[PDB]
Amino acid sequence: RTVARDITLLECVGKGRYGEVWRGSWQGENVAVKIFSSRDEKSWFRETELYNTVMLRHENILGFIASDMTSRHSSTQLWLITHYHEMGSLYDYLQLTTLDTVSCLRIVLSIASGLAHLHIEIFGGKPAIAHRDLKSKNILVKKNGQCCIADLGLAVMHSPRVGTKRYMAPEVLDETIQVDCFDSYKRVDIWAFGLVLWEVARRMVSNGIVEDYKPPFYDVVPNDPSFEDMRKVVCVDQQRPNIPNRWFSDPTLTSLAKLMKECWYQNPSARLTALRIKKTLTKID
Numbered sequence: 001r002t003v004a005r006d007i008t009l010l011e012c013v014g015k016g017r018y019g020e021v022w023r024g025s026w027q028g029e030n031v032a033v034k035i036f037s038s039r040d041e042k043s044w045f046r047e048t049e050l051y052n053t054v055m056l057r058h059e060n061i062l063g064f065i066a067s068d069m070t071s072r073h074s075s076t077q078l079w080l081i082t083h084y085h086e087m088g089s090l091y092d093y094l095q096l097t098t099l100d101t102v103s104c105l106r107i108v109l110s111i112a113s114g115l116a117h118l119h120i121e122i123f124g125g126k127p128a129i130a131h132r133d134l135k136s137k138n139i140l141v142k143k144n145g146q147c148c149i150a151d152l153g154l155a156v157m158h159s160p161r162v163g164t165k166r167y168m169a170p171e172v173l174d175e176t177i178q179v180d181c182f183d184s185y186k187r188v189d190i191w192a193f194g195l196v197l198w199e200v201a202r203r204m205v206s207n208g209i210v211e212d213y214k215p216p217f218y219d220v221v222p223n224d225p226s227f228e229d230m231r232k233v234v235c236v237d238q239q240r241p242n243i244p245n246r247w248f249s250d251p252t253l254t255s256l257a258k259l260m261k262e263c264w265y266q267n268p269s270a271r272l273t274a275l276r277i278k279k280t281l282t283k284i285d
């Protein structure tokens, strides 16, 4: 048999400290190709080890196609190949796009769905998985209006790289997280989910009003905030993102404000579960 391997790289759609993402083509069809820096090799190894353990398949998880390691003269080349989502990341999308009630709920319920799928152990199935770097740049917008969760390079299974500091829960910033305890990692993801819910909700129009896109804590920390900057805001002062008055005129945003509050308790065990968040979102509107 012929094994047509060649992928054509067509367009760079992302470049960062730790690698690049390309739109590519395989057999006339778009794929996404993440090329890792050797500095972030462990993220390729961890995502590859996870998919060699359990082949996740879910409409709200970025679709795996391949992991490739290629020997070069004096280096190793590491690629991850996935489905390609031409609308780009939720972070990208929220910059110019505003939302209505239906599109806002569809986005956040799709994210909750993907996250609950990661978190749940299924017997016979999948181990429970915590993401550990959930944020709007790690969520892609699909053409059908649902999103999918990307980047399992920091993920942990239950049967170097740390999370993005802006999205870190208070127990991560004050180093009290119970590291031997899998439920602790799920509760870190729930905190981060609440921040993503805030980012999205701001862009939902009500009574002709919308907020501009801002990242969580934009008004209290610098760009590329330090670990200490974050700890002082989140742990010492116990600040949370602002809920604008205009949300309390809209039943959807009133319900979403309540939800995001229940993701942000200082006590990790008080936070909602992903399954409970899904149930609450199905009862809104």
Ligand SMILES: COc1cc(-c2cncc(-c3ccc(C4CCN(C)CC4)cc3)c2C)cc(OC)c1OC
Pocket (backbone or CB within 6 Å): 002, 003, 004, 005, 006, 007, 026, 066, 067, 068
């Ligand atoms: C090695 O590397 C890459 C390979 C491919 C690729 C290309 N054509 C065909 C295949 C194929 C799939 C599956 C089977 C099955 C058939 C049934 N039988 C009982 C078990 C085996 C055979 C062949 C693949 C996997 C694409 C790649 O990238 C897009 C590759 O690079 C990462």
Ligand SMILES: COc1cc(-c2cncc(-c3ccc(C4CCN(C)CC4)cc3)c2C)cc(OC)c1OC
Pocket (backbone or CB within 6 Å): 026, 065, 066
């Ligand atoms: C990696 O990704 C892609 C792969 C392929 C692809 C190419 N050749 C052969 C295959 C294949 C054939 C047959 C079996 C099975 C069938 C049932 N049973 C008897 C076990 C053996 C498995 C695999 C595939 C899946 C196509 C893709 O897209 C159209 C891929 O996605 C980009």
Ligand SMILES: COc1cc(-c2cncc(-c3ccc(C4CCN(C)CC4)cc3)c2C)cc(OC)c1OC
Pocket (backbone or CB within 6 Å): 013, 014, 021, 032, 033, 034, 080, 081, 082, 083, 084, 085, 086, 087, 088, 089, 092, 137, 138, 139, 140, 150, 151, 152
């Ligand atoms: C977060 O993580 C990963 C993401 C992806 C991924 C998959 N589909 C699409 C994208 C993308 C496409 C296009 C744009 C822009 C460029 C064109 N236009 C001007 C606006 C839109 C942005 C983003 C990406 C980045 C793949 C990954 O691995 C292969 C990722 O890592 C796991």
